[PDB]
Design a protein around this nucleic acid. Sequence first.
RNA 1: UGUCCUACGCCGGCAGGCGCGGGUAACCCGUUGAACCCCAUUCGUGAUGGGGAUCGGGGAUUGCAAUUAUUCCCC
Lengths: 125, 55, 61, 144, 25, 72, 189, 126
Amino acid sequence: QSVQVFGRKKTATAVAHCKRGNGLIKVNGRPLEMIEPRTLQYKLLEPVLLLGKERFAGVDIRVRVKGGGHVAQIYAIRQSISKALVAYYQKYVDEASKKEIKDILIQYDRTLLVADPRRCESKKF
Amino acid sequence: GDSIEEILADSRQRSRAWLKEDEPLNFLDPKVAQRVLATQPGGFKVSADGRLIIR
Amino acid sequence: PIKLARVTKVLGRTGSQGQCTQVRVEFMDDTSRSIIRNVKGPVREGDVLTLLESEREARRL
Amino acid sequence: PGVTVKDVNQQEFVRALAAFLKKSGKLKVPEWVDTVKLAKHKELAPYDENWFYTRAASTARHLYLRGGAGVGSMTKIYGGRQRNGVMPSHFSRGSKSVARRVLQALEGLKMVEKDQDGGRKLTPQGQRDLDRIAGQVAAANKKH
Amino acid sequence: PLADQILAGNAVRAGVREKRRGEEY
Amino acid sequence: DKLNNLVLFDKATYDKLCKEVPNYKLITPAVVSERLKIRGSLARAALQELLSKGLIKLVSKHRAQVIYTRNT
Amino acid sequence: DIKLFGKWSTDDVQINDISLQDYIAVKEKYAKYLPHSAGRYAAKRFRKAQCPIVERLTNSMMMHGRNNGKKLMTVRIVKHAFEIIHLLTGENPLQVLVNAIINSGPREDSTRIGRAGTVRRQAVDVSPLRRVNQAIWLLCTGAREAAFRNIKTIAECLADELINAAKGSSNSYAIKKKDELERVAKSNR
Amino acid sequence: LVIPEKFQHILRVLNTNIDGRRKIAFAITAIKGVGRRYAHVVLRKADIDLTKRAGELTEDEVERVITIMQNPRQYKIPDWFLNRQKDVKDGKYSQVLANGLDNKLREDLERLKKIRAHRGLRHFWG
RNA sequence: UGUCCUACGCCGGCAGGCGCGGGUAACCCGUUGAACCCCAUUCGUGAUGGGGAUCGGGGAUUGCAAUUAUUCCCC
């Protein structure tokens, strides 16, 4: 049993797969702490630090990203990690846990669950 | 073909899909085919009596 | 002496290019004095203003 | 349970892999190593005198990730920005002979062989070598 | 009225001007 | 006017570094060179000497900015 | 506790000015880890008042053309600026920053009007939002024109600008530019 | 480190002054005929540590720099890397530095003037 | 994007040569390995390792033909 979600930015699309495990997070086969722009390391670690290391201990997430850029991928990774957990706690944990996760995760930053509807504007003759 | 909108009508391209984003989307849900789509989402004169005027 | 004032309502924008707005203020030490002032920049109700001299009422057409 | 290439810092891994290749002494270093720019868009020659080993190490690491890469593919990896004088800049490839002579040099180390469907890949003995060195990378960094 | 005319000439007109400038699927 | 910053330590200023620089509350290549009037190439090369001798704590290492501090 | 950069706490920051409470937004709800958020803080009037005060600092150092776009470099600078401010002074670099915004705000300004040739000035008061918009601008142009051609790194020009402004010293670009704006406004009542 | 007791502030090389404060890879570029690219391979063939300034090089290693850059071909400096290739008069490969650069340039000017080519006439008139 | 886009092998330091394949194309180029960006090194306020014009010598390619430098590369 597992849950398959997505999160997006301008063009950087992510897909996340979460199932039972011991608490490892991988992106494109690499750990969460080896993703290349180390200045924005906290944006990758925000859903882990807001919720706690204990809350992620029952789930293993593997994330794949394609497209966009260096910071557009980080904003899509952090979205689909948090969105994978709120979907996993809904279907296989009681809704009281899912409501309190979705509560504190929106009051921090609204882009962890609801995507940013901003895309490049076209040009016409 | 028989709904009210379809009958009262004033009369590459097929691979396009619209994801919808609520509860977060799960691709491994058995009812996920509901949340993907295949197409686009989303005059006469009146008398003083109120009767229509047709010509 | 420096004086602080809280605005009450925005009367409208004045100036030739509309670079100022005219706002009615009320004080903090005593809520009786209500003078009229001109300010530049974005102003809304409830803003607190620092008035260098609280003697003259501003005026423009 | 064993660590792999992807689980460690790629910058620390190249410094460890090039230090491994230099200590072996079996790489075939060409004679014009001290007198060439390794791209047509460079202003100068490499600052490091032992630039051939770090180029050799970065060749093996890139072949581990996405195999089947030829000379033309590796000049595209190592290309950069060519500032064309007063004209706007463009993207230019690397130098093909430096990329080729590395792949010949890795073949003499018995680390790289040709691929039947394209360019070059890693030897089964080659991948045994790189995954071992990632062990010393994580032991001296993540365990300190 | 005189007082209406004076107060209109002392305050600033404001109000009406509409400036026209500027996901589920 | 024009700067004639020294490229190598003379005897007078080398002593001035080894008894005064480890008590500034801030040690940086750029703040050393403004007051000791030396080039920035040696201003950072003098500090890795002091770091190896253990006279200075390191705060941050970066390719753009390096920040140093007193011991106590 | 949600800390800036993992090591700066927003709990102890006390804003001394009554007028600027609503607009200097660094307290328990606006405490973020990083000054990068990509938030839509300019789609509505007074939306940017709720933007955190350090993110407004990094957006204003992305200035003069060659640096337009590079925000990962400016958050690098404000990270190094706070680690220098802790070194020189010894207290919270957020406390030094909010003292700088208060002391660098012009409390009274002047406007230029003229009917035909005769261009004269009238002194008007400054809204509490523009007291912050002018304060961030003066500190960022203070540090930019401070170095620009010497060996001083911008990380330690920006630290030496924020420290001087919080002290109220006349060595600041911001304090010297604020006072001449005050001096013109006094002469033009 | 400190100034050595035999440090040179100004070095006299090929009848020009070479500044001793500048690094050896780029102080050599003060003489004409060598650049950032030629002087790097010359110091590589001489096996001289490039971290050294131009001032603390002793009389031993400064003279083998000269016999390398005046005579490059016997130290495997390749034929394409030299500025003076096949001459018009005596076709051979060389690297002209101090006054040979100005004399060869002057000679290439008056050769085009004497034959009255277009390129030589427009140099004269311009 | 295209029957002109190119993969791969060999040679040269680079421009560039020789050979052999894929693709009328969500099929090959192409998991379009783009540049700023990110991390380390050297430089240290100096018309400087900023800036590249204008020049000298040589090499290569397309063209009936390169002179008044077609274009590209090296010093």
